[PDB]
Amino acid sequence: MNTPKEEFQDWPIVRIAAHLPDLIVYGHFSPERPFMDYFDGVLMFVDISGFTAMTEKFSSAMYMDRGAEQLVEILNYHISAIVEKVLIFGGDILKFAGDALLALWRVERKQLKNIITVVIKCSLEIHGLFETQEWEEGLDIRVKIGLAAGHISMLVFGDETHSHFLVIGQAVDDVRLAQNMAQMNDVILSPNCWQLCDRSMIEIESVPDQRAVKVNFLKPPPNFNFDEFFTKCTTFMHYYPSGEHKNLLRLACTLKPDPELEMSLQKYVMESILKQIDNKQLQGYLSELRPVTIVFVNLMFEDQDKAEEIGPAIQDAYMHITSVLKIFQGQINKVFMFDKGCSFLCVFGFPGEKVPDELTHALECAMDIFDFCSQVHKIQTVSIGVASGIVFCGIVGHTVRHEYTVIGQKVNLAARMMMYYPGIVTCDSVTYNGSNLPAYFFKELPKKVMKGVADSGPLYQYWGRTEKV
DSSP states (O other): OOOOOOOOOOOHHHHHHTTSOHHHHTTOOOSOSSEEEEEEEEEEEEEOHHHHGGGTGGGSGGGTTOHHHHHHHHHHHHHHHHHHHHHHTTOEEEEEETTEEEEEEEOOGGGHHHHHHHHHHHHHHHHHHTSSOOSSSSSOSOOEEEEEEEEEEEEEEEOSSOEEEEEESHHHHHHHHHHHHOOTTOEEEOHHHHHHSOTTSEEEEEOTTSSOEEEEEEOOOTTOOHHHHHHHHHTTOTTOOOGGGTTOSOGGGGOOOOHHHHHHHHTTSOHHHHHHHTTSSOTTTTOEEEEEEEEEEEEEOSOTTOHHHHHHHHHHHHHHHHHHHHHTTOEEEEEEEETTEEEEEEEEETTSSOTHHHHHHHHHHHHHHHHHHHTSTTOOEEEEEEEEEEEEEEEEEETTEEEEEEESHHHHHHHHHHHHSTTSEEEOHHHHHHHOOOGGGEEEOOOOOOTTOOOOOOOEEEOOSSSOO
16 A cells, blocks of 8 residues: 655644643643642743834835834744744743743753753854844844743633733742843843852853853863753653654644644634634734734732732732723733733724724723722732834744734833833823823823833823822
8 A cells, every 4th residue: 555644734723832832732731720830940031122123123114015024024034043942952932922032941850950051052052043143233133041940830820711821930030030131142040040050061250239140151071962961851851852753843743633622722822813723814914013002911919939829819810801801802912920920911902993982991991900900919019001002913933833922112111111100000192192081080290211112202190080099
């Protein structure tokens, strides 16, 4: 008999899995919400804000009607190279969130030392991708890398239709803190990472007023062979593609139809993405420059590093947020950790209902979320930034590992407002002026110099309908 080769590998479940990390795809966990689990690993946080800064280059009339298409193509070109590096070095890309890629090497505690070596080598090779590259002489096609290691907690929350996850804990706090200390082309190790690492491999320098360290060089011992060392480390990498599948970047490319698994995984993915996956919408439909209103919600906790403490609070907040968003067709685009808690990137369509009505609705939704989340046990501070304007939307990343993302000046503005104006609902001038709501529903705020955003215009607090608050 003939032996035709080439198994079909383009199933809906495989396409869904491109949007998720191995942590979820192979997770097999409890139906209970919140769900918490605990493990150890090494985290890499790659700041790609230099790449996402290109939303401004591609807003130019020079791109004719194709700024969104050109942006996603160039972003995917460079980001795919980073993703391939992480995956070939055995990492799991957790999230494209906050203008960054967060990756994880989950391993037993005894193996953290050797895996830190693999992750440092990966980080240096990521920098190596961008060694020559630049054409606009601006926006900066370079990256900053923070690494951390230690205890990691995972939180899964959601309802019967939708699921989200977060990784939480001191290593998570440390990885974003380490990346913030980095200059372009730097690799910064968290204090615990530097405590746990193989010091014979590397030369470091101190970071002033910090216990974190900068990697100057990876200079291994004379008899060291990285390929042989990496092969040894793969013993501890559960899902590293191997044998017949050593040509694949992800084991998830081998997933076969399994209705129970697909039912679980689709909950993490937006319905408009599933429509495209099902070939019920054109593959290019979601790459666009569109007017939206961003509602960015920040929840602060005393113990942002402890999942048992914050998990029920996030679940409770999520159940309310999703009910408020449902009424006015808002979406949660992303959930991710900041230094003191949990950020929800919510998005409304701006011409989904016209002029004063939609902007009024986004403000009213913001206040509703603010009032409910303020009364959630263990939520210490709620802060909400509301900003309206043109953003880039699209599926960004590699063929095998990509996520729908929203980027642009107005996303960055809503994110900074919720940090610089904590404890209140704030909005930009487009939202304030557009809502046509009476002026006494607001308070004009003192101007702040917010790192990363320039010429913000007047900002306002949404005080609400009465003198209350």
